[PDB]
Design an enzyme around this catalytic site. Sequence first.
Site, PDB file in Angstrom:
ATOM      1  N   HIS A 133       0.824  -1.208   0.000  1.00 11.13           N
ATOM      2  CA  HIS A 133       0.000   0.000   0.000  1.00 11.13           C
ATOM      3  C   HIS A 133       0.859   1.259   0.000  1.00 11.13           C
ATOM      4  O   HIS A 133       0.379   2.350  -0.317  1.00 11.13           O
ATOM      5  CB  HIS A 133      -0.938   0.024   1.207  1.00 11.13           C
ATOM      6  CG  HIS A 133      -2.128  -0.870   1.069  1.00 11.13           C
ATOM      7  ND1 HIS A 133      -2.782  -1.062  -0.129  1.00 11.13           N
ATOM      8  CD2 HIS A 133      -2.786  -1.623   1.983  1.00 11.13           C
ATOM      9  CE1 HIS A 133      -3.791  -1.896   0.053  1.00 11.13           C
ATOM     10  NE2 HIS A 133      -3.815  -2.251   1.325  1.00 11.13           N
ATOM     11  N   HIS A 173      -6.438  -7.133  -0.736  1.00  9.25           N
ATOM     12  CA  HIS A 173      -6.493  -5.721  -1.091  1.00  9.25           C
ATOM     13  C   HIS A 173      -5.601  -5.426  -2.297  1.00  9.25           C
ATOM     14  O   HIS A 173      -4.613  -6.119  -2.531  1.00  9.25           O
ATOM     15  CB  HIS A 173      -6.071  -4.848   0.095  1.00  9.25           C
ATOM     16  CG  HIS A 173      -6.881  -5.072   1.335  1.00  9.25           C
ATOM     17  ND1 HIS A 173      -6.568  -6.040   2.266  1.00  9.25           N
ATOM     18  CD2 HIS A 173      -7.990  -4.450   1.802  1.00  9.25           C
ATOM     19  CE1 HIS A 173      -7.448  -6.004   3.251  1.00  9.25           C
ATOM     20  NE2 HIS A 173      -8.323  -5.050   2.992  1.00  9.25           N
ATOM     21  N   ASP A 264      -5.201 -12.365   3.793  1.00  7.60           N
ATOM     22  CA  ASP A 264      -6.485 -11.858   4.256  1.00  7.60           C
ATOM     23  C   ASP A 264      -7.607 -12.271   3.309  1.00  7.60           C
ATOM     24  O   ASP A 264      -8.779 -12.029   3.581  1.00  7.60           O
ATOM     25  CB  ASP A 264      -6.443 -10.337   4.405  1.00  7.60           C
ATOM     26  CG  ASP A 264      -5.532  -9.675   3.394  1.00  7.60           C
ATOM     27  OD1 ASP A 264      -5.092 -10.356   2.442  1.00  7.60           O
ATOM     28  OD2 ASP A 264      -5.260  -8.468   3.550  1.00  7.60           O
ATOM     29  N   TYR A 304      -4.923 -11.401   8.939  1.00  6.33           N
ATOM     30  CA  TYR A 304      -5.211 -10.969  10.306  1.00  6.33           C
ATOM     31  C   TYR A 304      -5.906 -12.024  11.166  1.00  6.33           C
ATOM     32  O   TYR A 304      -6.287 -11.753  12.305  1.00  6.33           O
ATOM     33  CB  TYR A 304      -6.044  -9.689  10.259  1.00  6.33           C
ATOM     34  CG  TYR A 304      -5.414  -8.651   9.364  1.00  6.33           C
ATOM     35  CD1 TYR A 304      -4.388  -7.841   9.829  1.00  6.33           C
ATOM     36  CD2 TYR A 304      -5.818  -8.510   8.042  1.00  6.33           C
ATOM     37  CE1 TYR A 304      -3.795  -6.903   9.010  1.00  6.33           C
ATOM     38  CE2 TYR A 304      -5.231  -7.574   7.213  1.00  6.33           C
ATOM     39  CZ  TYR A 304      -4.221  -6.774   7.702  1.00  6.33           C
ATOM     40  OH  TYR A 304      -3.634  -5.840   6.881  1.00  6.33           O
TER      41      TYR A 304
HETATM   42  C1  LIG Z   1      -9.478  -2.637   9.840  1.00  6.19           C
HETATM   43  C2  LIG Z   1      -9.099  -1.732  10.988  1.00  6.19           C
HETATM   44  N1  LIG Z   1      -9.191  -2.047  12.278  1.00  6.19           N
HETATM   45  C3  LIG Z   1      -8.753  -0.971  13.065  1.00  6.19           C
HETATM   46  C4  LIG Z   1      -8.658  -0.815  14.504  1.00  6.19           C
HETATM   47  C5  LIG Z   1      -8.174   0.394  15.048  1.00  6.19           C
HETATM   48  C6  LIG Z   1      -7.783   1.442  14.206  1.00  6.19           C
HETATM   49  C7  LIG Z   1      -7.877   1.288  12.792  1.00  6.19           C
HETATM   50  C8  LIG Z   1      -8.364   0.070  12.240  1.00  6.19           C
HETATM   51  C9  LIG Z   1      -8.582  -0.406  10.862  1.00  6.19           C
HETATM   52  C10 LIG Z   1      -8.300   0.406   9.547  1.00  6.19           C
HETATM   53  C11 LIG Z   1      -9.571   1.081   9.023  1.00  6.19           C
HETATM   54  N2  LIG Z   1      -9.286   1.931   7.857  1.00  6.19           N
HETATM   55  C12 LIG Z   1      -9.781   1.252   6.634  1.00  6.19           C
HETATM   56  C13 LIG Z   1      -8.904   0.055   6.310  1.00  6.19           C
HETATM   57  C14 LIG Z   1      -7.519   0.243   6.072  1.00  6.19           C
HETATM   58  C15 LIG Z   1      -6.721  -0.834   5.784  1.00  6.19           C
HETATM   59  C16 LIG Z   1      -7.275  -2.123   5.730  1.00  6.19           C
HETATM   60  C17 LIG Z   1      -6.366  -3.307   5.406  1.00  6.19           C
HETATM   61  C18 LIG Z   1      -5.507  -3.212   4.322  1.00  6.19           C
HETATM   62  C19 LIG Z   1      -4.305  -4.170   4.193  1.00  6.19           C
HETATM   63  O1  LIG Z   1      -3.635  -4.468   5.203  1.00  6.19           O
HETATM   64  N3  LIG Z   1      -3.951  -4.714   2.911  1.00  6.19           N
HETATM   65  O2  LIG Z   1      -2.910  -5.539   2.801  1.00  6.19           O
HETATM   66  C20 LIG Z   1      -8.647  -2.317   5.970  1.00  6.19           C
HETATM   67  C21 LIG Z   1      -9.454  -1.231   6.260  1.00  6.19           C
HETATM   68  K   LIG Z   2      -3.727  -7.969  -4.389  1.00  7.59           K
HETATM   69 ZN   LIG Z   3      -4.610  -6.723   2.712  1.00  7.67          ZN
END
Ligand SMILES: Cc1[nH]c2ccccc2c1CCNCc1ccc(/C=C/C(=O)NO)cc1
Ligand SMILES: [K+]
Ligand SMILES: [Zn+2]
Length: 357
Positions: A133, A173, A264, A304
């Site tokens: 990312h 993702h 994931d 996760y």
């Molecule tokens: C999913 C999650 N749990 C929490 C707990 C506390 C603070 C932030 C968070 C978040 C992030 C929320 N922002 C949106 C988001 C951002 C990133 C992701 C995962 C992406 C990833 O890791 N791809 O490889 C999923 C959702």
């Molecule tokens: K991917």
């Molecule tokens: Zn991911």
Amino acid sequence: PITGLVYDQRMMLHHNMWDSHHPELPQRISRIFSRHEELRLLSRCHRIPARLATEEELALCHSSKHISIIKSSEHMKPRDLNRLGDEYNSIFISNESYTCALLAAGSCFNSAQAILTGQVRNAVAIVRPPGHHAEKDTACGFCFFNTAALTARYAQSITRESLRVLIVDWDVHHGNGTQHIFEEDDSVLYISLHRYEDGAFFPNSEDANYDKVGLGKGRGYNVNIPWNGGKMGDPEYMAAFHHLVMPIAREFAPELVLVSAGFDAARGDPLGGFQVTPEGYAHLTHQLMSLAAGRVLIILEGGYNLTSISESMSMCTSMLLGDSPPSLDHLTPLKTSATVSINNVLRAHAPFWSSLR
Ligand SMILES: Cc1[nH]c2ccccc2c1CCNCc1ccc(/C=C/C(=O)NO)cc1
Ligand SMILES: [K+]
Ligand SMILES: [Zn+2]
Ligand SMILES: [K+]
């Protein structure tokens, strides 16, 4: 025939000071490592050491401004760590974050180095925080620096400029960072399978759609396979590999395969919502092993569910070790929207890849 494995518990130091229950846990890499040991996998592997990436090496993909900002967080008070974290999308920072990010990148450099010099054939990298990312100029989605993209550039630096490197991203993702970095590059082919839902899924950009095939001389070297219509699994991902990923990969004929291996999209993950099994990841791994004379590096990204990601990545290592693929079932039928998704990608990359028609 030997398989490399790099792991360093120092990468657990990166942590969320304000929410200790944040999914990107330190135990993600430790649990995976433990599982390799339980399953007699670690013993069958050559232990590649971890190391710090250099600021010179970070500059292969990242701006000096972005590097300096993350670097400075090493000496910040909790208050300033908080404010810096809120300047990015989905980023938490602690005093050890920058170091762990360097270790993650540096670990994959040595792993890539070991492969290309014949010290090992393939290798797994149990690292954190993730990287796909991470953009050139910013952090995003639990990522600080783009480990995979940097490893590709590093691999080219210690071989030749036009070393054909295939990056396969099967994290659920879209690797927005990895796409943008090589968007105009034809030496690095980027293939990503990702949940999309018409943009209603992280990182919520239309840059992940099938119509984004690349720019300039990189046109056709960016392959987005975007899933719509809910839960996907083994049937969908195997069909994607059968008719898209592998045919395009063979024509490209890579000399090094890097896998952005998030888990994931696995069955049991609270975020992805997919159901790819450990047996599924094993067959994905096995198929990729037929490319680039087996020169495959599996780099951890997301994932996760501590049990799901431990079982899944272990399966991949088992395949790299040359073990027989487990039995795969219920590969029929596919969700209709999956067939449609594959058909949209085929239509988009048909002009660039003769192996598709
Ligand atoms: C999913 C999650 N749990 C929490 C707990 C506390 C603070 C932030 C968070 C978040 C992030 C929320 N922002 C949106 C988001 C951002 C990133 C992701 C995962 C992406 C990833 O890791 N791809 O490889 C999923 C959702
Ligand atoms: K991917
Ligand atoms: Zn991911
Ligand atoms: K590309």
